Enzyme design. Structure first.
Site, PDB file in Angstrom:
ATOM      1  N   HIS A 101       0.935  -1.230   0.340  1.00 36.48           N
ATOM      2  CA  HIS A 101      -0.026   0.299  -0.021  1.00 36.48           C
ATOM      3  C   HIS A 101       0.913   1.127   0.241  1.00 36.48           C
ATOM      4  CE1 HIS A 101      -3.895  -2.318   1.326  1.00 36.48           C
ATOM      5  NE2 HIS A 101      -2.894  -2.955   1.938  1.00 36.48           N
ATOM      6  N   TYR A 102       0.349   2.441  -0.158  1.00 38.23           N
ATOM      7  CA  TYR A 102       1.155   3.780   0.512  1.00 38.23           C
ATOM      8  C   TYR A 102      -0.081   4.628   1.418  1.00 38.23           C
ATOM      9  CZ  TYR A 102      -1.966   5.998  -3.717  1.00 38.23           C
ATOM     10  OH  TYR A 102      -2.787   6.189  -5.051  1.00 38.23           O
ATOM     11  N   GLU A 115       2.512  -0.547   4.343  1.00 35.54           N
ATOM     12  CA  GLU A 115       2.267   0.653   4.442  1.00 35.54           C
ATOM     13  C   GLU A 115       2.697   1.708   3.589  1.00 35.54           C
ATOM     14  OE1 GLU A 115      -1.056   2.634   3.556  1.00 35.54           O
ATOM     15  OE2 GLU A 115      -2.386   0.673   4.945  1.00 35.54           O
ATOM     16  N   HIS A 132      -2.215  -3.486  -3.640  1.00 34.92           N
ATOM     17  CA  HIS A 132      -4.178  -3.655  -2.988  1.00 34.92           C
ATOM     18  C   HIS A 132      -4.613  -3.339  -5.105  1.00 34.92           C
ATOM     19  CE1 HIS A 132      -6.925  -1.607  -0.031  1.00 34.92           C
ATOM     20  NE2 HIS A 132      -6.754  -2.447  -0.221  1.00 34.92           N
ATOM     21  N   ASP A 185      -3.648   1.912  -5.395  1.00 34.32           N
ATOM     22  CA  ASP A 185      -2.691   1.475  -4.786  1.00 34.32           C
ATOM     23  C   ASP A 185      -1.214   0.694  -4.623  1.00 34.32           C
ATOM     24  OD1 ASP A 185      -4.138   1.097  -2.899  1.00 34.32           O
ATOM     25  OD2 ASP A 185      -2.867   0.926  -1.460  1.00 34.32           O
TER      26      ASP A 185
HETATM   27 ZN   LIG Z   1      -4.255   1.246   0.697  1.00 32.90          ZN
END
Ligand SMILES: [Zn+2]
Ligand SMILES: CO[C@@H]1O[C@H](CO)[C@@H](O[C@@H]2O[C@H](CO)[C@@H](O[C@@H]3O[C@H](CO)[C@@H](O[C@@H]4O[C@H](CO)[C@@H](O)[C@H](O)[C@H]4NC(C)=O)[C@H](O[C@H](C)C(=O)O)[C@H]3NC(C)=O)[C@H](O)[C@H]2NC(C)=O)[C@H](O[C@H](C)C(=O)O)[C@H]1NC(C)=O
Ligand SMILES: [Zn+2]
Lengths: 241, 241
Positions: free
Chosen positions: B24-25, B88, B135, B145
């Site tokens: 993710h970001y 993340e 994701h 993302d």
């Molecule tokens: Zn995300």
């Protein structure tokens, strides 16, 4: 390990990876079950032996993946191994007569071992009654354990699985008026209960397997998978808990 | 009355509950990311900061469930949280400017932190490259993302994600002969790669979202989701596991 790791902080948004508990029987005695479940192609976290009191074996910790479920679905969750705890019970399975199928009952020792275990596992992992389920449920056309002789009613009594309340049943068939719903309706209610079921409106094996599985749990007097009025009453009276 | 546990025996037939790694970001800075991921009702196991060198934060043990994925599917596996590790990365995601959409690139510090982490996680959990994914892959068109600026090529170079060999593309275009396959074919190849995709021959947003997501990963020069010849070459040249 490796790059600059920080372990100061901890998320409040945290949970168990284990959402479901899958019940099984071994089709083999205690000695063979231990071998199969430790060095076979298959495994479970727990194995409830035959003796009195029934001895429970932890073969895989609840933190790692046991291989008990195979191709599976419940409430839209697929491949349940990684997300579940499997519990095998030494029990001989079934036999075939010309007039249907007969099954070995579970020793009472094993049931009284099973309940405390399920309470403990469910508490630690925050698993709800609707997610404590049989193998027959998560693969209806492929599996049939722990079979019609599993006393779900005892687990219901311990609050461990869904069960209709007294006269919920009798109230539901009063609502049906004697009119049997169509296949598509049954298919809707089954999917709603968590089963993988066709939505065609046709009654093929696939749809019949699933209704059969539900009958085994809640109305094991007959589970031919044939749409009945009583089954419809269960499909409404049975909680989603 | 009751059981007693035996832990003398232990099964060889067990592995990790974690099958996938989801990238993710954050769409927000480091300070706010820490708060959100520790007390926001969204979580990830790891958070790669934008400092240099990039600091990696363990916020949830790889043992428990982090809430990062939501409604998800990869290779037929649904609801990936329980079966995955979320990572993340502090990165503003995109912004919507008068000159189109702009995406923020990832700091090189955070990439060099990410790779070792992914190697370490993949080694311990026995996770294959085809299961280290974004994701955008597990929810095409709902999510996007870590976006087209994620250097999958670098992860490919570290052997962490599927990637075509040097001569593979060019050989696949040569096989295609300049003739572009139909939507149904693209839909077949995408589902084969693990994507949830329609099978209906129609080229709606649903099918377009998924091809768009694949383009973002392997051909981010354009990811309109419009069937390409180059995309088809990727759908053949790209390893499937
Ligand atoms: Zn995300
Ligand atoms: C190698 O390990 C062992 O093998 C298997 C794992 O690979 C596994 O065996 C599986 O066992 C189940 C039950 O034990 C068995 O179930 C049959 O499948 C279908 C679906 O239920 C039944 O179809 C029913 O048809 C009738 C007539 O229409 C209806 O009354 C009914 O409604 C139908 N559907 C239902 C009830 O849902 C089938 O009956 C058919 C018609 C028949 O008898 O010909 C089922 N049997 C019964 C008794 O109803 C399944 O075939 C089998 N196959 C798999 C999994 O592919 C063993 O089980 C576990 C892991 C275990 O015990 O540990 C494996 N292990 C051992 C030790 O044996
Ligand atoms: Zn079973």
């Amino acid at each position: 390990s490796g790059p600059r790791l920080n372990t100061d902080y901890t998320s409040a948004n945290q949970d168990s990876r284990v959402q479901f508990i899958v019940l099984h029987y071994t089709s083999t005695d205690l000695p063979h079950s231990l071998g199969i479940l430790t060095h076979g192609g298959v495994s479970a976290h727990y194995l409830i032996g035959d003796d009195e009191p029934a001895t429970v074996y932890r073969l895989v910790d609840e933190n790692r993946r046991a291989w008990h479920a195979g191709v599976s679905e419940w409430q839209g969750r697929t491949w349940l191994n990684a997300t579940s705890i499997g519990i095998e019970i030494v029990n001989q399975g079934y036999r075939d007569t010309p007039q249907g199928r007969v099954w070995y009952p579970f020793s009472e020792a094993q049931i009284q071992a099973l309940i405390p275990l399920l309470k403990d596992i469910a508490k630690r992992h925050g698993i709800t009654p609707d997610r404590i389920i049989g193998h027959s449920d998560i693969a209806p056309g492929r599996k049939v354990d722990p079979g019609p002789l599993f006393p779900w009613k005892r687990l219901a009594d311990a609050g461990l699985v869904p069960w209709p309340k007294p006269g919920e049943l009798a109230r539901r068939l009063a609502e049906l008026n004697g009119q049997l719903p169509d296949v598509r309706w049954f298919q809707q209610q089954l999917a709603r209960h968590g089963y993988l079921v066709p939505q065609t409106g046709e009654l093929e094996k696939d749809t019949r397997d699933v209704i059969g599985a539900f009958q085994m749990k809640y109305r094991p007097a007959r589970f031919d998978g044939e749409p009945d009025l009583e089954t419809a009453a269960l499909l409404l009276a049975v909680p989603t808990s």
